[PDB]
CSV table of C-alpha atoms in Angstrom, one decimal:
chain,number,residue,atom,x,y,z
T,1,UNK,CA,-26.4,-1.1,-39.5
T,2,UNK,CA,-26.9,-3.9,-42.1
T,3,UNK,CA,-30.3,-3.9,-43.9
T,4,UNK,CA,-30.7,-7.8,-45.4
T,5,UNK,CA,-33.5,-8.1,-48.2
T,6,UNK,CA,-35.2,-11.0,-50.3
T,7,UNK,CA,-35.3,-10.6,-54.1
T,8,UNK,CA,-38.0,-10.6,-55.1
T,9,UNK,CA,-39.2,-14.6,-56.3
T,10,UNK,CA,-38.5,-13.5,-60.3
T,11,UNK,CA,-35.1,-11.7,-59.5
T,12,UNK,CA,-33.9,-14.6,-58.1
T,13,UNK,CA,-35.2,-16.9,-60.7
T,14,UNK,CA,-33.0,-14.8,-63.2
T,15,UNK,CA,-29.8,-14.9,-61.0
T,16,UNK,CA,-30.6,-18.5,-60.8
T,17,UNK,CA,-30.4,-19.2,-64.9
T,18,UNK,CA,-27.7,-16.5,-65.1
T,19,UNK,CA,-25.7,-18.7,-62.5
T,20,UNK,CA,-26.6,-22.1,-63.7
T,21,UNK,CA,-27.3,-22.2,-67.2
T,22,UNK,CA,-24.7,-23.7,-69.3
T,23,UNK,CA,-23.7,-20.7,-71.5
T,24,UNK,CA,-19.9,-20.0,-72.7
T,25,UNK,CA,-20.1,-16.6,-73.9
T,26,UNK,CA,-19.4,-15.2,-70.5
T,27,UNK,CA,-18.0,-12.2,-71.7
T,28,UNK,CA,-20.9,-10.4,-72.1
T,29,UNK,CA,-21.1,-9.0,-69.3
T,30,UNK,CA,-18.4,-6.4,-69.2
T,31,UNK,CA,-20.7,-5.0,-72.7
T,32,UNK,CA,-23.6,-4.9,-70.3
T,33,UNK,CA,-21.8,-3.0,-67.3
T,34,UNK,CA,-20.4,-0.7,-69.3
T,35,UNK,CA,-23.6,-0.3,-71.4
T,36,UNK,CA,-25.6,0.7,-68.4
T,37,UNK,CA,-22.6,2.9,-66.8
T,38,UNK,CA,-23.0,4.9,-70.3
T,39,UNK,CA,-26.8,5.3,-69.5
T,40,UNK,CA,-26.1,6.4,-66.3
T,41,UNK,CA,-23.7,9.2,-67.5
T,42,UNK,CA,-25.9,10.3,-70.3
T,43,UNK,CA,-28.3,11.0,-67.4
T,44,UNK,CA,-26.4,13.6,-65.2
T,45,UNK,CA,-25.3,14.8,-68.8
T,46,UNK,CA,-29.0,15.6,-69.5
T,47,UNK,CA,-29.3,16.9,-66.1
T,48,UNK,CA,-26.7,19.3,-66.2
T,49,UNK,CA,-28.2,20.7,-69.8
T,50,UNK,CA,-30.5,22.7,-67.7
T,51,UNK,CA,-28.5,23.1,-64.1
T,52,UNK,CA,-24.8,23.0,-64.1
T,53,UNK,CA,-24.8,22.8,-60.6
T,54,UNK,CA,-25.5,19.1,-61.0
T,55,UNK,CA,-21.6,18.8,-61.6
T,56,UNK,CA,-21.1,20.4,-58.5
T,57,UNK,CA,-20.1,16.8,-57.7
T,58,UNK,CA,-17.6,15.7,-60.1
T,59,UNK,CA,-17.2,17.5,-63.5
T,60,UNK,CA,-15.5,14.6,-65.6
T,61,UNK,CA,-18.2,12.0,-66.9
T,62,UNK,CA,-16.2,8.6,-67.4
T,63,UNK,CA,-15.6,4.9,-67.4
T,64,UNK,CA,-12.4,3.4,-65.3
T,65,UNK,CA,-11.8,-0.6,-65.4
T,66,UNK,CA,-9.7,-1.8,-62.5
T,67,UNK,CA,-8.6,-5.1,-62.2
T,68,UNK,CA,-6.9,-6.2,-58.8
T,69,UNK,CA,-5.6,-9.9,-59.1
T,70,UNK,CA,-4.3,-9.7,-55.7
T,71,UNK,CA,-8.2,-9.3,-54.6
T,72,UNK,CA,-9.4,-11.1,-57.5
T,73,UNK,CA,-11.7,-8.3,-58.3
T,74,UNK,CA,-13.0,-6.3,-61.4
T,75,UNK,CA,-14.2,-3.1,-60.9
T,76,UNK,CA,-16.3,-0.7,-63.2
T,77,UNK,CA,-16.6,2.6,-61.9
T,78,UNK,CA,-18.6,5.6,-64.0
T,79,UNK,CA,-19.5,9.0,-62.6
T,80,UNK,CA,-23.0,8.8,-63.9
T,81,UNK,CA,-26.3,9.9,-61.8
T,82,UNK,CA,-25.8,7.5,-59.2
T,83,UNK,CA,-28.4,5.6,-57.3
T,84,UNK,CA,-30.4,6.5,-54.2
T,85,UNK,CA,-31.1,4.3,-51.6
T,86,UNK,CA,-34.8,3.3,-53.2
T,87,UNK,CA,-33.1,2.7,-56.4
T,88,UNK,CA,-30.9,0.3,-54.7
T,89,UNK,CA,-33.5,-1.6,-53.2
T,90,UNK,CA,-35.8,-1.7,-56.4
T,91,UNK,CA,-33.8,-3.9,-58.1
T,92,UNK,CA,-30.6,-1.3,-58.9
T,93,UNK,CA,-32.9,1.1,-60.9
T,94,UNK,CA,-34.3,-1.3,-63.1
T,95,UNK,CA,-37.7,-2.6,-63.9
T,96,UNK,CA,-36.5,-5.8,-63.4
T,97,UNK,CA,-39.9,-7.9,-62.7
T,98,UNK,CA,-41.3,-7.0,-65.7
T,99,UNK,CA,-37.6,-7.4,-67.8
T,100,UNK,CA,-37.2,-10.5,-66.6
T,101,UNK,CA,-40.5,-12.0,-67.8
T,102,UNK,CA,-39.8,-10.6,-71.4
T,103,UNK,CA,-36.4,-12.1,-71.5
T,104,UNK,CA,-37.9,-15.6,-69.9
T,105,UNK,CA,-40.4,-15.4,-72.8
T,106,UNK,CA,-37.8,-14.7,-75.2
T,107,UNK,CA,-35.2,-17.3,-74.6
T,108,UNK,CA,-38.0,-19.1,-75.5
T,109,UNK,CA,-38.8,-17.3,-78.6
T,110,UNK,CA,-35.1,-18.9,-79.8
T,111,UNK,CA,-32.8,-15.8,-78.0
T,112,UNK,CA,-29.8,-16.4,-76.0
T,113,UNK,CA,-28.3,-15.0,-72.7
T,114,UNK,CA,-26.3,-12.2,-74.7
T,115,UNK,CA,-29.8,-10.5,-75.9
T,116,UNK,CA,-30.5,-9.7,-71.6
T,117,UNK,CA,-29.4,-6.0,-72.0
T,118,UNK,CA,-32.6,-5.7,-74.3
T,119,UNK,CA,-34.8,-6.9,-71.6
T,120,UNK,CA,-33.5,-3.5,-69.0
T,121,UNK,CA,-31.6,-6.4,-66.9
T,122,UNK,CA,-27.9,-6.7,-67.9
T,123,UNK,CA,-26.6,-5.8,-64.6
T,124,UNK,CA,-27.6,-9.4,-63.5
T,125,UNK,CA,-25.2,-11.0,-66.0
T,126,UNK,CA,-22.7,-9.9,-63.6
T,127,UNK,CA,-22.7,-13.2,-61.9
T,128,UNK,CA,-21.8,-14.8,-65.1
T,129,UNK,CA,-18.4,-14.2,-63.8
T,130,UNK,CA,-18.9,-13.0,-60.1
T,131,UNK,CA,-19.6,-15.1,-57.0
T,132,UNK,CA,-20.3,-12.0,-55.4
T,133,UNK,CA,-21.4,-8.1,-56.2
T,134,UNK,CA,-20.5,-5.2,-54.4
T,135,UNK,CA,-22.1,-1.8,-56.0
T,136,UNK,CA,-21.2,1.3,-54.0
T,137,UNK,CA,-22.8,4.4,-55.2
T,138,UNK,CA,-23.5,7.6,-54.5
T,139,UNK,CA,-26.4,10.6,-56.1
T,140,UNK,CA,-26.9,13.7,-55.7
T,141,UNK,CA,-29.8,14.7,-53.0
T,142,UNK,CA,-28.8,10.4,-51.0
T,143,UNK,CA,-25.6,9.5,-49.1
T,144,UNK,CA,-22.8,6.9,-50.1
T,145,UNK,CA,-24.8,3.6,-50.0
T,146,UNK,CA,-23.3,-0.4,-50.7
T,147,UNK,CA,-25.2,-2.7,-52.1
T,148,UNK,CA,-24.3,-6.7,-52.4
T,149,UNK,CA,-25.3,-10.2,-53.1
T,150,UNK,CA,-23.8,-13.3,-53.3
T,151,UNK,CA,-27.4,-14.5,-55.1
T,152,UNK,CA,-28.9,-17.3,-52.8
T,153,UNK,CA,-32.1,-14.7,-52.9
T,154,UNK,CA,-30.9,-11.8,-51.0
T,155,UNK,CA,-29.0,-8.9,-50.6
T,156,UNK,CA,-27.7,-6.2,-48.1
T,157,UNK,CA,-27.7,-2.4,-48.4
T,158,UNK,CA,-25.6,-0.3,-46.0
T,159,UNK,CA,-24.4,3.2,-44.9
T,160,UNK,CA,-20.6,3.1,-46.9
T,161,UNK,CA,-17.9,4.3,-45.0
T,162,UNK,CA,-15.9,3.9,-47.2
T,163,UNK,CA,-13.9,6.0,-49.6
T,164,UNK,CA,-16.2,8.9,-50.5
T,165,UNK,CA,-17.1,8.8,-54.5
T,166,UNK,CA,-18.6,12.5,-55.6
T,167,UNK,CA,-21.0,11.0,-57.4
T,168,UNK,CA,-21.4,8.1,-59.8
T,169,UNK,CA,-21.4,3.9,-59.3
T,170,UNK,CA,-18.7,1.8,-58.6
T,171,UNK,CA,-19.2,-2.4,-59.7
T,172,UNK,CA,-16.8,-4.4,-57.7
T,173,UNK,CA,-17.2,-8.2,-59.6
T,174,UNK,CA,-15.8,-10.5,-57.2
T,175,UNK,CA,-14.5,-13.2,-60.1
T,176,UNK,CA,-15.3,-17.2,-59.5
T,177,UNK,CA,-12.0,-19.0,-59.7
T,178,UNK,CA,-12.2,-19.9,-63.0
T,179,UNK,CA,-12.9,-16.7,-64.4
T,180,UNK,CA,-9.8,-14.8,-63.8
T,181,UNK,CA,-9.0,-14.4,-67.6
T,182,UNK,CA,-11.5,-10.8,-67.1
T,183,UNK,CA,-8.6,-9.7,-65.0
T,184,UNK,CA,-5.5,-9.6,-67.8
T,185,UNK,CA,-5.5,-6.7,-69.8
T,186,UNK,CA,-5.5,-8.2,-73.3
T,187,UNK,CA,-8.6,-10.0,-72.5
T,188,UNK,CA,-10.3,-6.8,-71.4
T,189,UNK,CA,-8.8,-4.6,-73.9
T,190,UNK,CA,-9.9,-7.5,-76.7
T,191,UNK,CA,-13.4,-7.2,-75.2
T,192,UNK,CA,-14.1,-3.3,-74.8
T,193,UNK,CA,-13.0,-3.3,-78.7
T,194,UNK,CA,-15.6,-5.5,-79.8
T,195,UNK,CA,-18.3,-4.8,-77.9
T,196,UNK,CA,-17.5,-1.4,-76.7
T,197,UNK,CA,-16.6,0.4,-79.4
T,198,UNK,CA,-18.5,3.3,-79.2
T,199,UNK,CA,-19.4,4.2,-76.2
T,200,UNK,CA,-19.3,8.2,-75.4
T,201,UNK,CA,-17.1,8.4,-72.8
T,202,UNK,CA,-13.5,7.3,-72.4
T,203,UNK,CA,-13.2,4.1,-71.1
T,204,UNK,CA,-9.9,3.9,-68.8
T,205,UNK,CA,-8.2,0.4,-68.4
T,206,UNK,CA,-5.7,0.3,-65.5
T,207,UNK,CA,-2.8,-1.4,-65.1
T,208,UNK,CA,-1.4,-3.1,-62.4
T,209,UNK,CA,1.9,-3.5,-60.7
């Protein structure tokens, strides 16, 4: 059971500059990712203050970065709060209507694509680098739910079968072919360094064979 949805008209105008505005600072995105996974941790953390049993799910509260060249695919996995189903659908837990007509108005105002994380929408500049999104996620009190979107103005949500996560968000970047440098570990490394720096939790780069 595959549930297909239309963005709403101004999410899709911001995928649509994301994809086609000429803008080489690309890498961006991974500060963004990792930026809201951080969010999303210091939320369960603030939940659990008050009711340990929030961690009932998954004690450790990190940040894994998993390249697969084989796949082509990036992935950023936390084990924040998670997302329901609703949050999903409204836009991955974002105020994203009214985000995206700040950062419209501000890239008029003189900013630049890099500045997007102010305006609550960094997810997005995923598709700096990705032709195609996969979020699987999973809070406490919905099931396991996948998200994606090639852009082209809509998206699917559906039931994951897949490999059960306790709790947390898992962003599966599906690189363009020209973007494969976000796979090799000195790029990633050089990037979580200078934009990264310091985040709260630890931030895990994997290797591959």
């Amino acid at each position: 059971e595959v549930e297909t949805f239309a963005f709403q008209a101004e999410i899709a105008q911001l995928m649509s500059l994301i994809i086609n505005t000429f803008y080489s600072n690309k890498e961006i995105f991974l500060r963004e990712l990792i930026s809201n996974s951080s969010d999303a941790l210091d939320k369960i953390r603030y939940e659990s203050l008050t009711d340990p049993s929030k961690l009932d799910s998954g004690k450790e509260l990190h940040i894994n970065l998993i390249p697969n060249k084989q796949d082509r695919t990036l992935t950023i996995v936390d084990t924040g709060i998670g997302m329901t189903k609703a949050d999903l659908i409204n836009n991955l837990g974002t105020i994203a209507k009214s985000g995206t007509k700040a950062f419209m108005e501000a890239l008029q105002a003189g900013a630049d694509i890099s500045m997007i994380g102010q305006f609550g929408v960094g997810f997005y500049s995923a598709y700096l680098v990705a032709e195609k999104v996969t979020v699987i996620t999973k809070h406490n009190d919905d099931e396991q739910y996948a998200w994606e979107s090639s852009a082209g103005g809509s998206f699917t949500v559906r039931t994951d079968t897949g490999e059960p996560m306790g709790r947390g968000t898992k962003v599966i970047l599906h690189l363009k072919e020209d973007q494969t440098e976000y796979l090799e570990e000195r790029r990633i490394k050089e990037i979580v360094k200078k934009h990264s720096q310091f985040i709260g939790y630890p931030i895990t780069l994997f290797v591959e064979k």
